[PDB]
Amino acid sequence: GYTLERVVILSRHGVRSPTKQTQLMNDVTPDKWPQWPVKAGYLTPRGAGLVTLMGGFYGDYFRSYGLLPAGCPADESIYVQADVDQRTRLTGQAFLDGIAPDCGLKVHYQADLKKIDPLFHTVEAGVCKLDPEKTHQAVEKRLGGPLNELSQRYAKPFALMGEVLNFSASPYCNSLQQKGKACDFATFAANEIEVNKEGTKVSLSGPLALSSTLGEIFLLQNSQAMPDVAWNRLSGEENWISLLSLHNAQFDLMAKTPYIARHKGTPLLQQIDTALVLQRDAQGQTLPLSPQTKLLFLGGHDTNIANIAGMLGANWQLPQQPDNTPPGGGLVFELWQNPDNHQRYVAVKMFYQTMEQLRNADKLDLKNNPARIVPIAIEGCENEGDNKLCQLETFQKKVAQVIEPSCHI
């Protein structure tokens, strides 16, 4: 039986309200968008509740492998570091409240909340720049051709989005008709990538970008347990998968394309790796970890998970969760050891709540209703057995190959 030595969780924050509403999001449907109980982008109180339920599951799971004891953890054995946003801070705290209730443990974060954290937003912080030509070339290579082919590649999902929106009856469609254009949702505008002149932001505009945002909104509505999701026009598991495939495609192109992913993800990959093996003074280990550290939780974003997955050549689909980087989901790194020969191994898993588990705020447990756990294959690793184990030396080698040296924190 192998020993679980240490764990790093790269978590998305929990259920949040939508990002700020734009005129375009309004104009592509005749219907009114449901209002939310919190400011744009904030974790909702129900979202914090769900994260706490997941924290409880994490606690049950890790305690089953003796990583943490019963009751309050040994001090300094869990470290929780969050990005500066409300949704990430509060997710970190909701996690602790679940995994170690009434233990006085606290989320930690950057001293100045009014500045970007380069660990979570490396390119934004100017650590390293994206070159516009290389970015365009890389996203072509990822996609397998020009952006105009997205309309065919995702024809059925785009048609479904237009249906869900009732796009044909929308102000945007009328503006097309008045110029003598048809109202094909897939081609309402061009898909275009823009790298700013500083090389500190890459943005996508057009139908894929919009559809990625809107599909997430619907998924959030459902996860928040709002009574009317997508105006009652979105039903069925395959429709959910198809609609969210636009969102996942947008994350693949904009966040997993290795040129972009390695620039954005180097600091987090190094922090993960160095925490996992507990090389406390190695380059890229940015946190005041103790020798007794057993578990690091990193409270971040879907983009962070995607960046890491793109660096590591990881790709997945989550049963009963159509967003690959879902609310409250965590990309979990486990260090295992064979006590017989001392060989160590890394395992990578997505831990997540299904749509139904989020909507119904299901209490989670190891036996009857567990969070879902999906083992993740890593490109160039042994991926051996059901747990897809990578030999530690192989994993360390892979990390060293895919980091961008210029993007060290």
CB 121 within 8 A of CB 301: no
CA distance 318 to 329: 10
CA distance 183 to 177: 7
Using CA of residue 112, residue 273, residue 52, residue 302, what is the dihedral sign? Answer: positive
CB 290 within 8 A of CB 78: no
CB 378 within 8 A of CB 388: yes
C-alpha gyration radius of the chain: 21
CA distance 335 to 356: 31
CA distance 252 to 95: 27
Nearest of 101, 131, 67 to residue 292 by alpha carbon: 67
CA distance 345 to 253: 30
Beta 295-300 vs 78-82: how paired, if at all?
Answer: parallel
Let me know if the fold of 1-129+256-409 is the same as that of 130-255. yes
Q: State the alpha helices, DSSP H only, in 278-301.
A: none
Token pair listed for 101: 């209730």
11 contacts: CB under 8 Å, gap ≥ 6: 91, 95, 297, 298, 299, 300, 328, 329, 330, 331
CA distance 348 to 155: 33
Neighbours of 285 (CB within 10 A): 19
Structure determination technique employed: X-ray
CA distances from 7 to 80, 84, 295, 376 (A): 12, 22, 5, 15
Residue 24's φ and ψ, nearest 5 degrees, are: -60, -45
Residue that is written with structure tokens 């600091």 in the block: 267
Domain ranges of the chain: 1-129+256-409, 130-255
H/E stretch holding 19: none
261 contacts: CB under 8 Å, gap ≥ 6: 255, 306, 307, 308, 309, 310, 311
Question: 147-157: b or e for each residue (b if 16 or more CB lie within 10 Å)?
Answer: beebbebbeeb
Q: State the alpha helices, DSSP H only, in 236-363.
A: 237-251, 258-277, 302-311, 355-359
CA distances from 365 to 315, 325, 362 (A): 27, 22, 10
Token pair listed for 28: 């592509």
CB 159 within 8 A of CB 207: no
Nearest of 357, 300, 331, 315 to residue 120 by alpha carbon: 300
CA distance 1 to 337: 9
Resolution (A): 1.7
Beta 3-12 vs 330-337: how paired, if at all?
Answer: antiparallel
CB 369 within 8 A of CB 363: yes
CB 173 within 8 A of CB 29: no
Token pair listed for 390: 């990578």
Active site residues: 13, 302
Token pair listed for 120: 């979570």
Token pair listed for 300: 């971040």
Neighbours of 218 (CB within 10 A): 23
CB 285 within 8 A of CB 271: yes
CB 278 within 8 A of CB 343: no
Pick the CATH number of 130-255 from 3.40.30.10, 3.40.50.1100, 3.40.50.720, 3.40.50.1240: 3.40.50.1240
Range 1-129+256-409: architecture per CATH: 3-Layer(aba) Sandwich (3.40)
DSSP state of 261: H
Rounded to 10°, the helix 207-223/155-165 angle is 60
CA distance 222 to 361: 11
Token pair listed for 113: 């909340």
SS3 143: helix
307 contacts: CB under 8 Å, gap ≥ 6: 255, 256, 260, 261, 264, 265, 268
CB 58 within 8 A of CB 73: no
CA distance 276 to 294: 9
CB 334 within 8 A of CB 357: no
Neighbours of 123 (CB within 10 A): 23
Beta 3-12 vs 295-300: how paired, if at all?
Answer: parallel
E-strand ranges in 83-221 read 108-109, 192-195, 202-205
308 contacts: CB under 8 Å, gap ≥ 6: 10, 261, 265, 268, 269, 272, 314, 331
- Please report how many Cα atoms fall inside a 13 Å half-sphere around the Cα of residue 79, on the Cβ side: 23
Token pair listed for 201: 């932001």
Max intra-chain CA distance, the chain: 75
Beta 330-337 vs 344-352: how paired, if at all?
Answer: antiparallel
CA distance 49 to 94: 7
Beta 108-109 vs 78-82: how paired, if at all?
Answer: parallel
